[PDB]
PDB file of C-alpha atoms in Angstrom:
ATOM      1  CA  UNK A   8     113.056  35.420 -76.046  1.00  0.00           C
ATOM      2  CA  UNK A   9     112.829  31.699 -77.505  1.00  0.00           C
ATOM      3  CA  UNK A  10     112.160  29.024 -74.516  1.00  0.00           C
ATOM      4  CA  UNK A  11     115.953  27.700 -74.709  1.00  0.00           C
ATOM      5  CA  UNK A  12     117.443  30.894 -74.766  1.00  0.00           C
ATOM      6  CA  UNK A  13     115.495  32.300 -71.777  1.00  0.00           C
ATOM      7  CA  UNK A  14     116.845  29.411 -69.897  1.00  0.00           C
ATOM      8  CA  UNK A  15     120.351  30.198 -70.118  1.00  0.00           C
ATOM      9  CA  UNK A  16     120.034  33.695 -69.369  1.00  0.00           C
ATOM     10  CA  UNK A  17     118.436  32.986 -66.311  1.00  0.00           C
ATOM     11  CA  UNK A  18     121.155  30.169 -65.208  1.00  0.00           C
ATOM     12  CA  UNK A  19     123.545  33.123 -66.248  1.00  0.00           C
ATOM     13  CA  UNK A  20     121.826  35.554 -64.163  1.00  0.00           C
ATOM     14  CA  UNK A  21     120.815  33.989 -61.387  1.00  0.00           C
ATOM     15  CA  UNK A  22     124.898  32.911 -60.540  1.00  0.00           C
ATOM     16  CA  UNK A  23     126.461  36.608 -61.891  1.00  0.00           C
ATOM     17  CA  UNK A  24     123.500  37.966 -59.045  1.00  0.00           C
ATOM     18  CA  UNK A  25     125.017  35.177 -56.312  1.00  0.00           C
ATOM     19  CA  UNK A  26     128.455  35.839 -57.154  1.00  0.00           C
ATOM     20  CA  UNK A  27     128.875  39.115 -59.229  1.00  0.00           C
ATOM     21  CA  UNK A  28     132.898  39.927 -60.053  1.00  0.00           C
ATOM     22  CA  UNK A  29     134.256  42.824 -57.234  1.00  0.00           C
ATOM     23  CA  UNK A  30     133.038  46.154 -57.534  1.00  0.00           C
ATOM     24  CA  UNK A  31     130.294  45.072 -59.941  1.00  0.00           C
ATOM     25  CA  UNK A  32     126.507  45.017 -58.532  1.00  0.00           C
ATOM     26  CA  UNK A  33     124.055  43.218 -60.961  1.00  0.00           C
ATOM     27  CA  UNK A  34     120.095  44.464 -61.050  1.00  0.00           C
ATOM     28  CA  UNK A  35     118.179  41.505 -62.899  1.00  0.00           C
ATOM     29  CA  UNK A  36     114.812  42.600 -64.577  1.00  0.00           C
ATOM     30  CA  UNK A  37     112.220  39.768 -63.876  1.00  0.00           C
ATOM     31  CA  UNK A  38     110.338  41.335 -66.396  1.00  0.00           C
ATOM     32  CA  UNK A  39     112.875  41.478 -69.051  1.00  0.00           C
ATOM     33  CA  UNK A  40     115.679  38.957 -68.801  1.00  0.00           C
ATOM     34  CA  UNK A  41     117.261  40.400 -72.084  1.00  0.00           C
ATOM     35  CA  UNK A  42     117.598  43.697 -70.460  1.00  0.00           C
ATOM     36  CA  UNK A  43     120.948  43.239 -67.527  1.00  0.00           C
ATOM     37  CA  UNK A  44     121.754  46.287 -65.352  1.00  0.00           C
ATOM     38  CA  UNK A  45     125.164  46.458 -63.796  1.00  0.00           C
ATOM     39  CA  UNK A  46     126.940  49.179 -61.974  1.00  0.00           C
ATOM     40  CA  UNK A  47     130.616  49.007 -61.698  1.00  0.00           C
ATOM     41  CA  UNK A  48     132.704  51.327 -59.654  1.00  0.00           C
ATOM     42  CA  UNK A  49     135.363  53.507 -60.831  1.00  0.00           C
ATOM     43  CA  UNK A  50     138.299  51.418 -60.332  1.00  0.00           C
ATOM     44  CA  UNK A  51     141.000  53.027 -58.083  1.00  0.00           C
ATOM     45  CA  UNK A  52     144.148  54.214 -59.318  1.00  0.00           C
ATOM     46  CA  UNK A  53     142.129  55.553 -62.431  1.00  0.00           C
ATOM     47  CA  UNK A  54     140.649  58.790 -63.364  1.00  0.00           C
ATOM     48  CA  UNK A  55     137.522  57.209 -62.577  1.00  0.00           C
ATOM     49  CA  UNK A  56     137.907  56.244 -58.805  1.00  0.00           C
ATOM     50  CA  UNK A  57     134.731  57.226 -56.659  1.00  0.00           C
ATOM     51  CA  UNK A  58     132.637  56.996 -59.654  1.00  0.00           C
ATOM     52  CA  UNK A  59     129.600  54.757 -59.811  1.00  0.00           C
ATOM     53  CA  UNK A  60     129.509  53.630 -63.669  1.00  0.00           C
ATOM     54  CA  UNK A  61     125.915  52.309 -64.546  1.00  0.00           C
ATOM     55  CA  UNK A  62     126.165  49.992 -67.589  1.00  0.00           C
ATOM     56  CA  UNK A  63     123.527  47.847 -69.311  1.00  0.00           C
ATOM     57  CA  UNK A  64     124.085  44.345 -70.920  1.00  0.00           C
ATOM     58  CA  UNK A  65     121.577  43.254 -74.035  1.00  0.00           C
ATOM     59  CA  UNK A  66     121.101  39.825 -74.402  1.00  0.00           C
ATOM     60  CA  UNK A  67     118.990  40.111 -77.365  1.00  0.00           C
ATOM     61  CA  UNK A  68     119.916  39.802 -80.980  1.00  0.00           C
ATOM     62  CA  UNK A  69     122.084  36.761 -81.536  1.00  0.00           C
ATOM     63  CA  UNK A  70     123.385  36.083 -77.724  1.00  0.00           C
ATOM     64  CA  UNK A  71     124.884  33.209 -77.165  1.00  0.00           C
ATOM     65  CA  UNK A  72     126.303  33.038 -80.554  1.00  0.00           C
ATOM     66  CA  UNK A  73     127.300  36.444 -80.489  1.00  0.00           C
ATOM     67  CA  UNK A  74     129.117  38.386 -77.337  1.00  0.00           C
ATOM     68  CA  UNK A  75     125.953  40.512 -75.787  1.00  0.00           C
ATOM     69  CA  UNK A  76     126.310  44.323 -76.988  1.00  0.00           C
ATOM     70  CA  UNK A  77     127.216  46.600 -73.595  1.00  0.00           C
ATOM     71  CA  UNK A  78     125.922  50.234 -73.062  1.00  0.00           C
ATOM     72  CA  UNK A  79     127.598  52.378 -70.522  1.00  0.00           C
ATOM     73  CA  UNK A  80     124.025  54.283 -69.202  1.00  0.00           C
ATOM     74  CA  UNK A  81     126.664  56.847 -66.952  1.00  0.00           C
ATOM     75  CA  UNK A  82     128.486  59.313 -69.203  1.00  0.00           C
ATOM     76  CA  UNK A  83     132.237  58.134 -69.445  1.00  0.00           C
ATOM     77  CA  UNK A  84     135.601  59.689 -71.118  1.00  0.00           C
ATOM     78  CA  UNK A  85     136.862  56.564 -72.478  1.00  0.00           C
ATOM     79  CA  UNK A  86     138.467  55.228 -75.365  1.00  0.00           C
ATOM     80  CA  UNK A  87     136.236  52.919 -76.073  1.00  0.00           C
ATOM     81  CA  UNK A  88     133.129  53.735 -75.357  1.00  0.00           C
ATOM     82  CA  UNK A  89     131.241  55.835 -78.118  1.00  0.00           C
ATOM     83  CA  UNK A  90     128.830  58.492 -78.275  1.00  0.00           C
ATOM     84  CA  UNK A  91     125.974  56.391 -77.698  1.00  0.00           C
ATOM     85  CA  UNK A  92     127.732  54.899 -74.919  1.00  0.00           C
ATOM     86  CA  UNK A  93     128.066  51.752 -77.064  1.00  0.00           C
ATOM     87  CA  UNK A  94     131.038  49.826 -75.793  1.00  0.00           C
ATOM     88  CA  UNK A  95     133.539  48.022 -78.267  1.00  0.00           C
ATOM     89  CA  UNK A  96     135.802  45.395 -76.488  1.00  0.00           C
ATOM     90  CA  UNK A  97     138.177  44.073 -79.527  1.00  0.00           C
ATOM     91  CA  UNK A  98     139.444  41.482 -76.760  1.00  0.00           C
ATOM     92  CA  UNK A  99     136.287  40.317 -76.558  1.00  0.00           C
ATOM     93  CA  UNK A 100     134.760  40.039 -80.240  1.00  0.00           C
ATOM     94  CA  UNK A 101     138.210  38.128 -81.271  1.00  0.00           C
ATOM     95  CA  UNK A 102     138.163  35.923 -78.325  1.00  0.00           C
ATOM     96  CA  UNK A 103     134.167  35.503 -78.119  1.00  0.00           C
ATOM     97  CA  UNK A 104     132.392  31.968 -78.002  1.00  0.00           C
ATOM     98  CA  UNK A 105     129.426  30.748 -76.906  1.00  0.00           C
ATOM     99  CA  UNK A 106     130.810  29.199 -74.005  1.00  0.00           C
ATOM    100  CA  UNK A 107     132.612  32.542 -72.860  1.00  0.00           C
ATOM    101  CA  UNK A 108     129.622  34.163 -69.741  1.00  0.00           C
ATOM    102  CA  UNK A 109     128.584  37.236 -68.502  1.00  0.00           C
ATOM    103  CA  UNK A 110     130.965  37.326 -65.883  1.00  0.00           C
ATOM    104  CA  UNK A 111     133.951  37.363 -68.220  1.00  0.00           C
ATOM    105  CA  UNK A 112     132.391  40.097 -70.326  1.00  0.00           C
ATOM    106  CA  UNK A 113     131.708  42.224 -67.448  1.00  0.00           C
ATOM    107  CA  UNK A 114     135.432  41.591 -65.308  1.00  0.00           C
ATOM    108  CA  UNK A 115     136.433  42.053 -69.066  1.00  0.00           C
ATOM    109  CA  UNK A 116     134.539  45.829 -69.141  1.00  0.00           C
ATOM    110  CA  UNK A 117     135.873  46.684 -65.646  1.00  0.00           C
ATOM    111  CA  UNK A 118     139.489  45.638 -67.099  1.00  0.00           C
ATOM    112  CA  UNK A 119     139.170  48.034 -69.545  1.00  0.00           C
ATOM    113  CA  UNK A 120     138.603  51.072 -67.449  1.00  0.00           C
ATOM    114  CA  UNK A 121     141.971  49.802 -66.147  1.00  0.00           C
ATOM    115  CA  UNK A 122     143.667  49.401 -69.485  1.00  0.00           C
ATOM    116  CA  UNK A 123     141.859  51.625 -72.236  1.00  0.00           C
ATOM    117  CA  UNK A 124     142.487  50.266 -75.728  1.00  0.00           C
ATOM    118  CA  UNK A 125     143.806  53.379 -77.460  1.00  0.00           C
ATOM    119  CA  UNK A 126     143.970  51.448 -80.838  1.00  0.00           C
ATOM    120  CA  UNK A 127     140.852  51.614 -83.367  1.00  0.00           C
ATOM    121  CA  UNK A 128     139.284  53.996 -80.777  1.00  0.00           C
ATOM    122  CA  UNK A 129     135.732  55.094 -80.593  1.00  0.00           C
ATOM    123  CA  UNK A 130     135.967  58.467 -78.736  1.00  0.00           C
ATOM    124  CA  UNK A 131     139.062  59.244 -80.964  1.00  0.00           C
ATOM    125  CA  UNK A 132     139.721  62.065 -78.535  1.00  0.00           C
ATOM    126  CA  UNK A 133     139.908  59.850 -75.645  1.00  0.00           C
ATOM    127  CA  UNK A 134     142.420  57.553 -77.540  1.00  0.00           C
ATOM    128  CA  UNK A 135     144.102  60.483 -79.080  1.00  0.00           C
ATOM    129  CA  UNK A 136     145.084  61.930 -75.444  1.00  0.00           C
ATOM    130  CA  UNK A 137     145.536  58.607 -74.191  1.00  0.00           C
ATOM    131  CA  UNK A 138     148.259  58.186 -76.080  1.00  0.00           C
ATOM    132  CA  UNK A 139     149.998  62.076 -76.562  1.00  0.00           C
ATOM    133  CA  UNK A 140     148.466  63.425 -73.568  1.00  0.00           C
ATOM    134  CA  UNK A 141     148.234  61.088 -70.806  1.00  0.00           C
ATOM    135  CA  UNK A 142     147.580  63.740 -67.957  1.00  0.00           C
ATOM    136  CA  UNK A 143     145.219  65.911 -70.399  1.00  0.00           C
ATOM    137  CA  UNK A 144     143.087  62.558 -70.844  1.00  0.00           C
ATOM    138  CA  UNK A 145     142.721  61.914 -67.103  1.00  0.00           C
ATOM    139  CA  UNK A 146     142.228  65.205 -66.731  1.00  0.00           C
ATOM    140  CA  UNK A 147     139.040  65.143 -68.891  1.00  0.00           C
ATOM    141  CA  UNK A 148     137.939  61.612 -67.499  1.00  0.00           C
ATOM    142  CA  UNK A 149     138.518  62.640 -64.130  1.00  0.00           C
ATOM    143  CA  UNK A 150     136.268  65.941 -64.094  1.00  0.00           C
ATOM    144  CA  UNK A 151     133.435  63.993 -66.565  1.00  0.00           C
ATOM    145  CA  UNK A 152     133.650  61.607 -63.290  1.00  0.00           C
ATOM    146  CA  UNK A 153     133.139  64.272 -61.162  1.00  0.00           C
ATOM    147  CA  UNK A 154     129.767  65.351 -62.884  1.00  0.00           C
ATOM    148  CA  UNK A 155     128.944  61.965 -63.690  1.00  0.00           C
ATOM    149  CA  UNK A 156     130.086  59.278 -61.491  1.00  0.00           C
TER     150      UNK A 156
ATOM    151  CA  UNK B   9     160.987  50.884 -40.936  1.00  0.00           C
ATOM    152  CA  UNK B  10     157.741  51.464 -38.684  1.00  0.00           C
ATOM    153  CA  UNK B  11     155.847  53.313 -41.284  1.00  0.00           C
ATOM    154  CA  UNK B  12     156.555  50.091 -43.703  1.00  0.00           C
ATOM    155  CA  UNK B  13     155.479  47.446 -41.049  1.00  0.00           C
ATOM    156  CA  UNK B  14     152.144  49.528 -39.479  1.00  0.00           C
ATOM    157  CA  UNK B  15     151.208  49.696 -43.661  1.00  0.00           C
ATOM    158  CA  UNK B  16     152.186  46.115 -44.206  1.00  0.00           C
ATOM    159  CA  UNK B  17     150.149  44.961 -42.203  1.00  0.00           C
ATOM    160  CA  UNK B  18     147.337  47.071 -42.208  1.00  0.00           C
ATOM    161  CA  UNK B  19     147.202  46.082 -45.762  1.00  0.00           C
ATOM    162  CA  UNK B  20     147.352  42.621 -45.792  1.00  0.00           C
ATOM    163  CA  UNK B  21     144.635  42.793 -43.352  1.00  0.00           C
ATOM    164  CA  UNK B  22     142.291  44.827 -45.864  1.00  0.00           C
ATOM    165  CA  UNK B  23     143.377  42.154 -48.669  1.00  0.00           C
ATOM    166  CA  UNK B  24     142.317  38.872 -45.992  1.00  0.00           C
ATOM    167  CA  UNK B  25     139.335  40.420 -44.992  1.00  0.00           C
ATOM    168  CA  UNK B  26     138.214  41.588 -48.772  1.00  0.00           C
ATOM    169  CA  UNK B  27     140.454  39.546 -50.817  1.00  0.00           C
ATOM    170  CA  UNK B  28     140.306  40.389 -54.647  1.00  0.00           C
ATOM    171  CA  UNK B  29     138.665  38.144 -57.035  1.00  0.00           C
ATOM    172  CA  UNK B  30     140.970  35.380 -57.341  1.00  0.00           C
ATOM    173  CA  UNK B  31     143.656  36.996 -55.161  1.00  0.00           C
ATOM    174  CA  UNK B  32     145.180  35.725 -51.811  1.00  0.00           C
ATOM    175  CA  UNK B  33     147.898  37.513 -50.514  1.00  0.00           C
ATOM    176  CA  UNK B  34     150.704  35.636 -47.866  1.00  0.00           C
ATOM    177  CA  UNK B  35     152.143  37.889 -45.422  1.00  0.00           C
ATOM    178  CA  UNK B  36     155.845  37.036 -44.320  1.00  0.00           C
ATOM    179  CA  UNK B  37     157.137  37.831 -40.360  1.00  0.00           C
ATOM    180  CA  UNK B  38     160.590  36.855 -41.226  1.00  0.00           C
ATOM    181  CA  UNK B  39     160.629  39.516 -44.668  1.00  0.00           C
ATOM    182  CA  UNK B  40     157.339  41.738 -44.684  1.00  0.00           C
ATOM    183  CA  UNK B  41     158.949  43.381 -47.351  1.00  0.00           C
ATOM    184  CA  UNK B  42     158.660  40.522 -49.706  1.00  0.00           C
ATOM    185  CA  UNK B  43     154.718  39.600 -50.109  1.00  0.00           C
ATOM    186  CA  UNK B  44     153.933  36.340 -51.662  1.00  0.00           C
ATOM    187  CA  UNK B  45     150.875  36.259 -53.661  1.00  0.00           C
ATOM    188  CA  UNK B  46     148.373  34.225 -55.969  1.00  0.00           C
ATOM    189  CA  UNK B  47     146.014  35.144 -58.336  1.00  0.00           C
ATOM    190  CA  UNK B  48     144.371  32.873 -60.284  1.00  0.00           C
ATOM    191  CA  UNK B  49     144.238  32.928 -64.407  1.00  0.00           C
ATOM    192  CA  UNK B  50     141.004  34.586 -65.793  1.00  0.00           C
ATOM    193  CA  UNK B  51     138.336  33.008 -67.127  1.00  0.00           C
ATOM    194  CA  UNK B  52     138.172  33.214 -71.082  1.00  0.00           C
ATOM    195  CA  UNK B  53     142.083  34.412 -71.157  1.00  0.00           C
ATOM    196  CA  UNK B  54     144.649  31.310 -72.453  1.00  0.00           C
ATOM    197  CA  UNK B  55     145.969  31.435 -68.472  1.00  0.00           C
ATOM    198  CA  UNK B  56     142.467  29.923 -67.447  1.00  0.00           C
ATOM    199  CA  UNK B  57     142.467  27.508 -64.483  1.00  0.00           C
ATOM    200  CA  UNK B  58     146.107  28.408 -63.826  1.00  0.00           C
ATOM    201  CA  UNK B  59     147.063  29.204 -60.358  1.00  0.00           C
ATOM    202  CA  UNK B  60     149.965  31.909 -60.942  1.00  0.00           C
ATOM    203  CA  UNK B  61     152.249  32.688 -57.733  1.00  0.00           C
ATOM    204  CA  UNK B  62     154.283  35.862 -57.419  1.00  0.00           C
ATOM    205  CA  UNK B  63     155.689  38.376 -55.019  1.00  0.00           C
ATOM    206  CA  UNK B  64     155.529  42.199 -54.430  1.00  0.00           C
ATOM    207  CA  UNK B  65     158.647  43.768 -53.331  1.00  0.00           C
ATOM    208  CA  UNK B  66     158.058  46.645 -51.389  1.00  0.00           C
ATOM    209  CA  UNK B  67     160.351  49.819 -51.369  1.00  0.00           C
ATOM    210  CA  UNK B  68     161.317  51.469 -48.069  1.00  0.00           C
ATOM    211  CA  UNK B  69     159.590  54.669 -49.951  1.00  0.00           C
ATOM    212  CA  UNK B  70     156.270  52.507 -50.167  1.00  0.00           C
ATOM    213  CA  UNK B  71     154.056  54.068 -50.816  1.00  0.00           C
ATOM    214  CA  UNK B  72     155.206  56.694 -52.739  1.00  0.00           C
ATOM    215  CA  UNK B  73     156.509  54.454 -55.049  1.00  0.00           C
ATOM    216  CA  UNK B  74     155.027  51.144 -56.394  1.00  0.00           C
ATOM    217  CA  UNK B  75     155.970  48.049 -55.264  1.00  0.00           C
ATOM    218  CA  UNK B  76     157.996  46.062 -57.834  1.00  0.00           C
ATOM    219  CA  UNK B  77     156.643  43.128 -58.698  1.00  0.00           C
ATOM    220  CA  UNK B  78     157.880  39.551 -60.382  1.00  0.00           C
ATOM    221  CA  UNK B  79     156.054  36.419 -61.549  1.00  0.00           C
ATOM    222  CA  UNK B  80     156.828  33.213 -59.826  1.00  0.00           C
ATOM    223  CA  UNK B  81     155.031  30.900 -62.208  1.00  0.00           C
ATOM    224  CA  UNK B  82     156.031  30.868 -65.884  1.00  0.00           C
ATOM    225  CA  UNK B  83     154.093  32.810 -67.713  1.00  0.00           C
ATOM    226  CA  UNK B  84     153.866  33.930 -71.235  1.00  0.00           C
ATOM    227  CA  UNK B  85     153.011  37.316 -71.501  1.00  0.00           C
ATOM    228  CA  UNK B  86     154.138  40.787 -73.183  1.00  0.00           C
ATOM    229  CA  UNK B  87     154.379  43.064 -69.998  1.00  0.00           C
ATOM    230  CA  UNK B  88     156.244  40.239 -68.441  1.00  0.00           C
ATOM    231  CA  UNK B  89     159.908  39.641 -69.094  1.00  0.00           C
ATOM    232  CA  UNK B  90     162.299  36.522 -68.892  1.00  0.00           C
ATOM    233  CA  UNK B  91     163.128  37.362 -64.646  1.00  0.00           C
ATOM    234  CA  UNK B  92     159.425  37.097 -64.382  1.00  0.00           C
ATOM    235  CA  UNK B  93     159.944  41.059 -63.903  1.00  0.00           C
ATOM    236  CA  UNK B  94     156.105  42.653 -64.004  1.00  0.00           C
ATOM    237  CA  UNK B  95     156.759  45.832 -66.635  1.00  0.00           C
ATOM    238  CA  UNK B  96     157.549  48.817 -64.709  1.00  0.00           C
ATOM    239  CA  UNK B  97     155.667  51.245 -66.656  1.00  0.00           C
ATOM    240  CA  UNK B  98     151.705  49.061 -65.994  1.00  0.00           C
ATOM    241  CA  UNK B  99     152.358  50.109 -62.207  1.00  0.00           C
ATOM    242  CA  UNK B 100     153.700  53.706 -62.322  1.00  0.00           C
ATOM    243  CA  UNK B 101     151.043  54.750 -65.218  1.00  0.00           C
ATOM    244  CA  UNK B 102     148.360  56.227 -62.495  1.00  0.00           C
ATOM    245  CA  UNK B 103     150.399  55.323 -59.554  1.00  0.00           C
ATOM    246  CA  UNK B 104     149.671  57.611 -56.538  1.00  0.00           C
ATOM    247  CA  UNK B 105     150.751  57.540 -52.944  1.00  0.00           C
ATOM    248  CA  UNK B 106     147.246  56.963 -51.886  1.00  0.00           C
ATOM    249  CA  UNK B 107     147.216  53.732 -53.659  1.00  0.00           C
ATOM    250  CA  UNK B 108     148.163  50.552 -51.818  1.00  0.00           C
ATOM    251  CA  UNK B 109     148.810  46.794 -52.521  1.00  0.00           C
ATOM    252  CA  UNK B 110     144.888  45.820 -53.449  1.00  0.00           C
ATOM    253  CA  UNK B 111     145.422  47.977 -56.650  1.00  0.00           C
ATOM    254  CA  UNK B 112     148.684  46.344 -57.861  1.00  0.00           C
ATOM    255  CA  UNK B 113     147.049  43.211 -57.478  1.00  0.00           C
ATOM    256  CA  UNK B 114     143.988  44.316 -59.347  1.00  0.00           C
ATOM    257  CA  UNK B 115     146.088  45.810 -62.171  1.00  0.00           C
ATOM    258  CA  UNK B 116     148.059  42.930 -62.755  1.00  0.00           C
ATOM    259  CA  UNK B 117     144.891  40.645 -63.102  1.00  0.00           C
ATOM    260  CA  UNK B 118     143.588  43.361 -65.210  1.00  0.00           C
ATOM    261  CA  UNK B 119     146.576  42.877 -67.387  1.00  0.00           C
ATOM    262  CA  UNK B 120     146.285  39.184 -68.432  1.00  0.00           C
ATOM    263  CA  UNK B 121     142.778  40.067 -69.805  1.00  0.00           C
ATOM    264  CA  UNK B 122     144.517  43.118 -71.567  1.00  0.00           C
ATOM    265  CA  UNK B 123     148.188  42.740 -72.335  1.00  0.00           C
ATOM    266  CA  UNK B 124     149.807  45.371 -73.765  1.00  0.00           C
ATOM    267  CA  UNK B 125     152.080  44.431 -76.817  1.00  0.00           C
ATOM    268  CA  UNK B 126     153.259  47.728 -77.544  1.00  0.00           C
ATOM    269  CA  UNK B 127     157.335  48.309 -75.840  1.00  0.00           C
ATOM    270  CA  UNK B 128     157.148  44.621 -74.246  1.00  0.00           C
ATOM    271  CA  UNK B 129     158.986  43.643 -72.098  1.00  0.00           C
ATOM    272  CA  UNK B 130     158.550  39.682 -73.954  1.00  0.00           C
ATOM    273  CA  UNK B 131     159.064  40.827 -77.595  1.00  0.00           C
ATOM    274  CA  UNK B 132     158.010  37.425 -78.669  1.00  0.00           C
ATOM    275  CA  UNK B 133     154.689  37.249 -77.071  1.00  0.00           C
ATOM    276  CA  UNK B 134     154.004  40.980 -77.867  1.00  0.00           C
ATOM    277  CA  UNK B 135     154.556  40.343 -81.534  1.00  0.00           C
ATOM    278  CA  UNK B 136     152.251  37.149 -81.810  1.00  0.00           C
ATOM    279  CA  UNK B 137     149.415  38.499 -79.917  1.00  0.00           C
ATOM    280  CA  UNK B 138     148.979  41.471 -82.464  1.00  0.00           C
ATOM    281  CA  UNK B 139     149.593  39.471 -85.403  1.00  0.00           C
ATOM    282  CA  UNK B 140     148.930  35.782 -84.519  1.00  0.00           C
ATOM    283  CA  UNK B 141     146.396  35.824 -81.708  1.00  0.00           C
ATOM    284  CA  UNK B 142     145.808  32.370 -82.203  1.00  0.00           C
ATOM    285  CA  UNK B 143     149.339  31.180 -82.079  1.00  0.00           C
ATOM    286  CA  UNK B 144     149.749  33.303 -78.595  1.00  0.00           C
ATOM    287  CA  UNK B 145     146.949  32.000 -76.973  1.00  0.00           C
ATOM    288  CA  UNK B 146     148.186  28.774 -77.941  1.00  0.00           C
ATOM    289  CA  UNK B 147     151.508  29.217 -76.399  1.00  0.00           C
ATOM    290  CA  UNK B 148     150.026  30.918 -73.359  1.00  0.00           C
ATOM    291  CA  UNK B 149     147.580  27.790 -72.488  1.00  0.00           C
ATOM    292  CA  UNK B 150     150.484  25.533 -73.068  1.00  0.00           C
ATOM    293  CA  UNK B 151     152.945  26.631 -70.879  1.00  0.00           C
ATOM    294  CA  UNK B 152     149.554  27.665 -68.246  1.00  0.00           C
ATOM    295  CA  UNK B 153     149.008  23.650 -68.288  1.00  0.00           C
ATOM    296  CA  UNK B 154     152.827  22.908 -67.570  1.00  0.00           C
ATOM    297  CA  UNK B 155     153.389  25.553 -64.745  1.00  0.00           C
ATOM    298  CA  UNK B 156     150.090  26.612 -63.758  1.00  0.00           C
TER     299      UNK B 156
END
């Protein structure tokens, strides 16, 4: 990464490590800063409660002019999260600056196991059940949680 | 109601000793049933820097049933309505007997990052965030500078 940019993702770091959001556990890579692994645990009152969620942040590309692109690394039933375990918050895209941290996009990522965006899903099964099958969808998430979490 | 007070308690005491991000709950000697609480406005959400108070109202059927739950500080807000009534339907979606105060809390903070505009309960603020987000931001930092 460029000399200015490596800067800032350290400052980033280094407080999200001293002070990560609850339930969230941040592993930085000293020898790749544009490489962020975060678990986050299954929040409760969820189909995934007891799950350990292992999720990576890239701060590549464009970051901090565009939001960092997010990668769920543990399988997850989710609305959106896509095959690739790509994850696709619209919140965040609409609302993104370059001021907006890390911290906000992961408490935003955690928030979303909470409340699932059904609309413009990208496992359109997930959103599909979400909304016409709410007990069928946790049903799925719960078990994938099971195997996975 | 000694199953209400021994839970009261041992709640609060879970939610002092590992409060929430941004949470603090108040417990109440006088009315245990009526919890006063703050959490404080997300960062990168229009209710940033605002410190919002409110109040769980717990059921002598707690836990089986969710605690209702208002807004003391104005807010503007779908799932919210005009008695500062928190939306029914955000607490009973997964709700579970096993579940206690800490997840209310941590729903509801979850909710001002993700509001729900479908069947608001504020019909105004539900419409503008779909269509104009701009507009409901806006209005949602506004009245966050007045009452937060």
């Amino acid at each position: 990464l460029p000399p200015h940019i490596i800067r800032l993702v350290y400052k980033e770091v280094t407080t999200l490590t001293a002070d990560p959001p609850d339930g969230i556990k941040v592993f930085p890579n000293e020898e790749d800063l544009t490489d962020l692994q975060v678990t986050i645990e299954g929040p409760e009152g969820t189909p995934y409660a007891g799950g350990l969620f292992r999720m990576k942040l890239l701060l590549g590309k464009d970051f901090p002019a565009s939001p960092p692109k997010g990668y769920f690394l543990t399988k997850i039933f989710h609305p959106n999260v896509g095959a690739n375990g790509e994850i696709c918050v619209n919140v965040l895209k609409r609302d993104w600056t370059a001021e907006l941290g890390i911290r906000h996009v992961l408490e935003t990522i955690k928030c979303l196991l909470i409340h699932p965006n059904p609309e413009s899903a990208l496992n359109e099964e997930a959103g599909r059940l979400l909304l016409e099958n709410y007990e069928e969808y946790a049903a799925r998430a719960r078990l994938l949680t099971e195997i996975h979490g």
